[PDB]
């Protein structure tokens, strides 16, 4: 069963799309993502991502991400688990921090946004 | 000037350790993460880290890390950016996700816990 | 137009229910919140809530409260903002941070879960 | 003993003052809030807070309050826990969200920076 494999194009509630190409034996995989929305008056760029996900009881293991943007300052990480539902549909839950680049130490307090998000597969 | 360069040992307030191996140019790095706290009851072990950096205005650039914990089914997703004061004193300032592995798509509710780290350079 | 207005019976996603009593003019607000589901392994129950909203340019404003939980030894709050979309739907975005009481200070890097709920009124 | 009544005035790291006014016997409690620092462009004033304490096994009870302020649309959240170390020092250990008022449902993906802040009793 290649169920829930993370190997693919994926997008999110947002219209987002991402994709993650072929995972590695150690888990890593990485990919690129298109993201709907920005934080920034900056034109979006498909931007590359780096990740790890960890071995496979039924349950899909967790995995997490970084997306190196390549029309912001900022970082973003996601960190999450597949899902498999009754009529065979695949959904990634996942929770994530944005973190734009401050001046000084001193402004770091503001520098994170977090949210969630839902992946289902691309047709 | 290597200050601030992520390349290195680095410990956090909770004692903590992580090794940062050189960066490529693409930016992204691996290293290990050595915890000295777990929410398991399972032996703390040494862990895989894969992470991106973004490219270096007098601002370090944001980073993103996802560490494979050995031990425990579970990911955490580290975001940040490295600071220096006067002295000459390097900080990376540090958000973070927890994601502990669910048996059903109805607990991911309670998956993720979020916190702050402070990291230092080992002398 | 009362579209949007706290006061009422919402529930979310998770299938949880929430009563909001009318504002008094300061805009605090009180009621009680019936959860769905928990993290520890006892009986649900009714729980009182203790918040504030922002005074009402077209936007509903910020609001935020505090669930006392009746059951457990946690806490939780919850922020967000009401939305009304095209065919009259109401809905409240929130963000939340579940703190469980830990026995010492050291624990406390691990007490804190995240989250997100949609809320829509009950008809 | 008073060790870790709420009831106080507490300053933060960021050099935030927040006073608490005592605890009604529901656990309710009130009192205000002067932020060092801000994410907008506008004179910083007091603001009121509103929260909510558990009822006190040698562990203080979780509380949470919101933040109502007066400059700004934004409403923070913070949710927290005292401790008492060896030489009788208090410290609160919190965890917050700060959520900005959005103009559509669209743009809640951004709404919403995290963090944690440790206040001591201001002597
Ligand atoms: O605005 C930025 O600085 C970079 C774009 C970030 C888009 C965020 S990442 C989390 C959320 N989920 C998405 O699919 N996009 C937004
Ligand atoms: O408990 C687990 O499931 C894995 C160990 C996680 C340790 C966390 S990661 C964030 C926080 N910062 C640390 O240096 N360790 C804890
Ligand atoms: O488990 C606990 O310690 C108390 C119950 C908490 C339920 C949480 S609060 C956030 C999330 N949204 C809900 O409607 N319920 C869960
Ligand atoms: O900028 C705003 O919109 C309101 C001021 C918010 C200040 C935040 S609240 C969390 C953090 N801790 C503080 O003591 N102040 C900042």
């Known amino acids: 069963t290649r169920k829930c494999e993370l190997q693919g194009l994926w997008r999110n509630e947002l219209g987002s799309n991402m994709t993650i190409s072929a995972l590695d034996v150690a888990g890593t995989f990485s990919g690129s993502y298109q993201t709907a929305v920005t934080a920034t008056n900056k034109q979006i760029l498909v931007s590359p991502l780096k990740g790890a996900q960890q071995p496979p009881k039924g349950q899909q293991p967790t995995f997490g991400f970084t997306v190196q943007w390549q029309f912001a300052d900022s970082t973003t990480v996601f960190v999450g688990q597949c899902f498999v539902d009754r009529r065979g549909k695949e959904m990634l839950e996942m929770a994530w921090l944005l973190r734009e680049e401050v001046?000084?130490?001193?402004?770091?307090?503001?520098?994170?946004?977090?949210?969630?998000?839902?992946?289902?597969r691309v047709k």
């Open 103 to 120: 001046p000084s130490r001193k402004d770091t307090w503001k520098a994170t946004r977090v949210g969630t998000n839902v992946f289902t």
